[PDB]
Amino acid sequence: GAHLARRYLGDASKEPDPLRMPTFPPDYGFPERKEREMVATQQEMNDAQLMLQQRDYCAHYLIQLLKCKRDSFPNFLACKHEQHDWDYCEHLDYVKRMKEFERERRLLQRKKRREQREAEMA
Amino acid sequence: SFPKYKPSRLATLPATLDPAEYDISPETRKAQAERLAIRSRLKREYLLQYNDPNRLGVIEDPALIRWTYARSANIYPNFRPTPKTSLLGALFGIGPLFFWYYVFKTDRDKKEKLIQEGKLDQTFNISY
Amino acid sequence: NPFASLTLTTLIILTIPIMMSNSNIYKTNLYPNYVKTTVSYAFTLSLVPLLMFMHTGQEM
Amino acid sequence: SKMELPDYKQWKIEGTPLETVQEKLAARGLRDPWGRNEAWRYSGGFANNVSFVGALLKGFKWGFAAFVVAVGAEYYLESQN
Amino acid sequence: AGGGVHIEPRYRQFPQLTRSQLIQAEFFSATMWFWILWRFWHDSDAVLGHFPYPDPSQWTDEELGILPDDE
Amino acid sequence: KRLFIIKPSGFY
Amino acid sequence: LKIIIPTTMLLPMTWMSKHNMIWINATVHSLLISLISLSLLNQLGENSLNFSLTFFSDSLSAPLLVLTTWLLPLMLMASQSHLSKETTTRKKLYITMLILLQLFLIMTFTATELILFYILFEATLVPTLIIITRWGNQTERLNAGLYFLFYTLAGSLPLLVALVYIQNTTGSLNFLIIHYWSHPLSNSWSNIFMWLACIMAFMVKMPLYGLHLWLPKAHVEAPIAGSMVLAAVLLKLGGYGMMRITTILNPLTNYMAYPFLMLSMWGMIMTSSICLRQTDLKSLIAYSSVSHMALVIVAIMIQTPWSFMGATALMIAHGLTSSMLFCLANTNYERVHSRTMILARGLQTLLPLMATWWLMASLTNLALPPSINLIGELFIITASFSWSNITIILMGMNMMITALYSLYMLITTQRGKYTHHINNIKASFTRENALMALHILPLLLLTLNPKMILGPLY
Amino acid sequence: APPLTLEAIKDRVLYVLKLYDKIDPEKLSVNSHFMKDLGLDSLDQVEIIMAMEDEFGFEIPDIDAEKLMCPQEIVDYIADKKDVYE
Amino acid sequence: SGYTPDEKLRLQQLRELRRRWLKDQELSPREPVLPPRRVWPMEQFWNKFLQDGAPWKNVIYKTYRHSIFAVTHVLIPVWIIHYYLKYHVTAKPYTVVERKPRIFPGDTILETGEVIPLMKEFPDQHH
Amino acid sequence: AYLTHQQKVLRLYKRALRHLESWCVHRDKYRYFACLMRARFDEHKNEKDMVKATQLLRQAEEEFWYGQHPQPYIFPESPGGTSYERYECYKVPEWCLDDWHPSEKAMYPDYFAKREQWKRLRRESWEREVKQLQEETPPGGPRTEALPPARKEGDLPPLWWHIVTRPRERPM
Amino acid sequence: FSTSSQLGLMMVTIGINQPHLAFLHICMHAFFKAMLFMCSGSIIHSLNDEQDIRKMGGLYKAMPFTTTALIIGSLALTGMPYLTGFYSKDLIIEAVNMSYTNAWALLMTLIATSLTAAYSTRIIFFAFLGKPRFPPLVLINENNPLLINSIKRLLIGSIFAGFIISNNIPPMTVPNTTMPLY
């Protein structure tokens, strides 16, 4: 997207290096660090056979989806709202993933702003 | 316009593009006369043996028998130990054998060097 | 429990036409139709393992 | 059957698009030898071929009615449910 | 091969067609046109995208928690 | 109208 | 021991029997003796089957003898194409040589003494040159005998001097005694030549790249009976020898193996590539035999458990198929009275069943799974790969060519368009078709349980 | 596919030659020699045979093309090539 | 420039000789004179009622065809297949191994009877 | 023997517009450029000078090699076609017939009886046709692969069996 | 060539950590690609074993059953939304372009898809549309029930399979939920 255009054609310091987010300390800038919690526990998370890529923060919205899908067999046309909840969490996972990328980008912009102002101030 | 179609060993030049084909002349005119005349006799006695009612056998082709001898037995009777054959014999003979010797020995000593202090991993390498 | 038997049969029942062919009992004509029925019946046999799969998901 | 061949009389360059080249060719100064040979591909039921988009929407005409009854029936089912 | 085929081999004309040959032609054409765009009406979301993608400029530094160049 | 077809001797 | 006496007992059998019953009487008793031989794969565990002071058997020999005892019926019906016009005494003496040949191979594999093995090992030569030269067809069959025998003795004779040297040093060479009274081979210069003398004798009867000129110079011109027996078991006589003699040649084997296994490695690609460019049909199987035979040279050289099993598996499997392609060579050669590949083409449209035998023969020689050719070849690859990782690029590149010439003979002979002027091929008799069947069925139905074939290390 | 009889193939060649504009649709004959009787030239034979090779699907060889200049002998070669016998 | 008369006079000689060749390649109505074969009684009573040809006659002909094919192609296999696994293959342990069905919070086990506790309150995500 | 100046242009035309058909595809497009190909072919009909005529061959072929379809069109039955020598799998030579077992030839008795009569015609006409050949061969064998016809009545044209008994193009 | 192009497309997916989606394509591709080859085999037999598009054309009306099968078969091959092809091919394109992958390597599957649709139009235009350039003697026929049932069996498959595999199978890949519109 746009990030690729600025990173490659232009300066790459304004764009995060794709293998390194987050670089700036997450605690700095984020008070009240009540870290991202889990509604499901690894016990039933293991008992419900879930592939590691599917073992994301949206885990609670796959397990119950697999439940109703199994119990509604063979009515594959049912269990859509539960499916609707699933991609909504994955959507929420994606937006907060965008927030993390842009937070790094804004810190990168601020990090340059802090340094040159401190550099050529004399 | 269009430069040419340059022939090669595997991309031969067609008779249509052949200049000498379009350069017909009297002395080569009679030269192509016996081409078919030789062919005509070779088609005559072949067909004569081909359609003979009492022909119960295989019509031996002297050209085929000549080809077999030339490619199977005649090579040494007309071989000459000229210098060129020696380089070709040496390059395609002990050449690759010693080349693979350098490759195989180097790995074997390298592998033996690595295991003798245990860098190579044989945690589950038992079926040697 | 059924999963093992049904899928294995889909393999076994696919090979009788080969052995009957070696028996030469087939008087042509009927053989291509005979082959089609075996493959078609192999397909129908191959369903009930598949419908089993989505119900639970067991893989053996 | 005895394979009765269609007669030549019913086949001519006129009407078929084969004329388009002909007077253009006649402008050059000659006339097309095999003018009537390819007229069969351009005449009869072989003519008026559908457009490329027209081929794509084959059966779309019945798609109109099929959509109306299906959606309307389900609309009634949901409304009365 | 044998004389008396359901269709006779004609020469250079439009071949004869049977009514039954045509019926299945637009049957599947209509059902395919039914199928590909009835489900379009069902869950159009699939070829629309269920969630809009906001550009990363409109988000304010509150949620990002990124202070300006002030302190 | 069908024609006789030549085949290799399969009896043996 | 119960195999040898009936095998000798067939000597009066053929020599006395009625003018027309000699082949019938010989064929049956060769078929019945496969019974008592078939009780030789019947085997105990790791301990070898020692049933006499001078004779013993193990899981390495057991597949070999049942191959030879089975083999003789194959050469019996194979010779029943061109021995009919010969006189009775010559016909009887042909069986004498084949039966005399059995008596030797049936005894080398059971020999429990190195010299007794060697005495009978090279004793098999005398029946051979009688077969190749007396009953050969072409002109250079005379040169065939000289090339075959002189190559063999030039390597076998230094082995005899080596064996008596071991006799004087350690005291005995009984195959068990040397195993139990093993002694590491020092790197002394003298031991190098003793190692070379011990191995070279089996190398020459193991076509190596350079020591293989007698392979195309013997198999092509030999009679049909002599062709298969020389390619199916005779080449394996060295194979039995090296599997046994290596017990006293360590650790000198590993350092000294590089000049030899590599020459087999590079030549086995070369020899297979030779088959891609050939004009004589019988030369294909001869050169194809060289490449396949040279494959187990690497296996024995590594002295890896997997390699030895793969060597034995390929050893018997190659012998069975190489004999088969020689039968198919004979039938086509007899019908056309020539050995040229390109002469007889499009034979499948005339002999459909013979094409199927050609199909199965070339496809088994192609070594597809699960055929014994593949499992023998695959075990060699895994053992070779463990020895060195580059080994796959070479021995794998052999399988490249191996599939090529195997199908090349099938396409140019059976497939294609028949040549019109050949008005000689009749319908195939029940003899060759049964001969092909008796070759193909034991190979296929051995595939279900091949553990009689892997060898003692299994 | 049903085979084409000698009458049928002579009838098929009858249609294509009659359609030709250079010839006249009333003088056409089964034995009428092309370049003399119908007043054609050597560079009219070539376009005749491809128009003959078209509706039949196969190719008469070039070596047999220059001598393929008689309507009766036209069908004789094709009937020989397809061995279609009434 | 065309054929030189001689070749033509020859070709028609070959033509008429070719005319007679495959004018002898056909078969007389009697040939092939089918040699007798022993016949099973099964087809005898199949054709004893097949000559009527009305719908239900051939339907039951196909109905038995389907069933007679089924028993010898889908019954006798599963007869020996089920014998093979349940009494020979499954008699040897670790030969047939099964995925344990994925238990989800709230399911009950037939043998134990204990319910796996339902997962705790969802974050209440609604669109 | 000779591809003289006559046939060379005749073959050249044949391969020229056949490639054009492979190019234009559409019949109306093909016809326009075919008559142009024809009209441009005979615009220099009166070219008595052979050297220029051979020269006119040079600009005919080299751009034909440039202008030929990179995927040239070939009908199935002709060299390069998708059906060339496709049915050789079924064409078995006629001589395999006499090898049929008594049961196999009793299978089709009328054909074998007629086949025997066909074998008769070859047997007592072979010596006549080879003798007829010999008395009409020029010295040093034949100077042309063409075969002489039947000179007198009764005798078949020389060397006729295989060209007559050739397997049918559609054997099955 | 379309088959090989499809194979390159599906193994790109397992390339970027999409094994199951490759298996999803293994079922759809086997459905309609068989139709395209079987349809070509049908018109070959009718058109006196002629197999060059320069001599096809005009078969849109002569053989309607094969006409309908190829158009909707090719539309699945091109990714007509809510058909068998779209549920795999366009889902794959939505997956590969949005991932950590090689730079241009996303452009074949973009450009090839454009070419994938390109030869589909060419095969429809030349073979079925256009004028009937085939030999004058017409022997074409597709009224044999063996063909009609054979094509029809996968035909309802090539129309309705896409849904009946997409919904029933358990979710085994991460669903692409939030992406740009373009």
UniProtKB/TrEMBL annotation, chain B:
A Pfam family reported for this protein in Swiss-Prot or TrEMBL: NDUF_B4
GO CC annotation terms, alphabetical: mitochondrial inner membrane; nucleoplasm; respiratory chain complex I
**Domain of life of the native organism:** Eukaryota
Which coarse location class describes where this protein primarily resides?
mitochondrion
**Keywords, comma-separated and alphabetical:** Electron transport, Membrane, Mitochondrion, Mitochondrion inner membrane, Respiratory chain, Transmembrane, Transmembrane helix, Transport
Tell me where in or outside the cell this protein is found: Mitochondrion inner membrane
Q: How does it sit in the membrane?
A: Single-pass membrane protein
Does the record's keyword annotation contain Transport?
Answer: yes
The yes or no answer to whether the keyword Translocase is present is: no
- Described function: Accessory subunit of the mitochondrial membrane respiratory chain NADH dehydrogenase (Complex I), that is believed not to be involved in catalysis. Complex I functions in the transfer of electrons from NADH to the respiratory chain. The immediate electron acceptor for the enzyme is believed to be ubiquinone.
Can you state the subunit structure given in the record?
Answer: Complex I is composed of 45 different subunits.
The similarity annotation says: Belongs to the complex I NDUFB4 subunit family.
This one is known as NADH dehydrogenase [ubiquinone] 1 beta subcomplex subunit 4
* Originating species: Sus scrofa
UniProtKB/TrEMBL annotation, chain D:
Per the record's keyword annotation, is Transport included, yes or no? yes
Cellular component terms, GO, for this chain's entry? Answer: mitochondrial inner membrane
Which superkingdom?
Eukaryota
How does the entry describe its membrane topology? Single-pass membrane protein
The cellular location(s) given in this protein's UniProt record come to:
Mitochondrion inner membrane
GO BP, one annotated term: electron transport chain
Primary localization class, coarse: mitochondrion
Keywords for this entry?
A: Electron transport, Membrane, Mitochondrion, Mitochondrion inner membrane, Respiratory chain, Transmembrane, Transmembrane helix, Transport
What's this protein's function? Accessory subunit of the mitochondrial membrane respiratory chain NADH dehydrogenase (Complex I), that is believed not to be involved in catalysis. Complex I functions in the transfer of electrons from NADH to the respiratory chain. The immediate electron acceptor for the enzyme is believed to be ubiquinone.
UniProt lists the family membership as follows: Belongs to the complex I NDUFB3 subunit family.
Q: What is this protein called?
A: NADH dehydrogenase [ubiquinone] 1 beta subcomplex subunit 3
UniProtKB/TrEMBL annotation, chain F:
Query: Where, per UniProt, does this protein localize?
Result: Mitochondrion inner membrane
Q: Which domain of life is it from?
A: Eukaryota
Subunit structure comment from the entry:
Complex I is composed of 45 different subunits.
The protein's job, in short, is:
Accessory subunit of the mitochondrial membrane respiratory chain NADH dehydrogenase (Complex I), that is believed not to be involved in catalysis. Complex I functions in the transfer of electrons from NADH to the respiratory chain. The immediate electron acceptor for the enzyme is believed to be ubiquinone.
The record's comment on protein family reads: Belongs to the complex I NDUFB5 subunit family.
Q: Please identify the protein, giving its name as recorded.
A: NADH dehydrogenase [ubiquinone] 1 beta subcomplex subunit 5, mitochondrial
Q: Which residues of the full protein are shown?
A: 52 to 63 of 189
Automatic annotation (TrEMBL), chain H:
GO cellular component terms, alphabetically, are: mitochondrial membrane; respiratory chain complex I
Q: Is Phosphoprotein one of the keywords UniProt gives this record?
A: yes
TM spans (from-to): none
Q: Any idea where this protein resides?
A: Mitochondrion
Q: What is its main location?
A: mitochondrion
- Give the record's keywords alphabetically: Electron transport, Fatty acid biosynthesis, Fatty acid metabolism, Lipid biosynthesis, Lipid metabolism, Mitochondrion, Phosphopantetheine, Phosphoprotein, Respiratory chain, Transit peptide, Transport
According to its UniProt entry, the protein's GO biological process terms are:
fatty acid biosynthetic process
Q: Does the keyword Mitochondrion apply?
A: yes
Q: Which residues form the Carrier domain?
A: 7-82
Function of the molecule: Carrier of the growing fatty acid chain in fatty acid biosynthesis.
Name the protein family.
Answer: Belongs to the acyl carrier protein (ACP) family.
Query: Which named protein is this?
Result: Acyl carrier protein
Q: Which residues of the full protein are shown?
A: 71 to 156 of 156
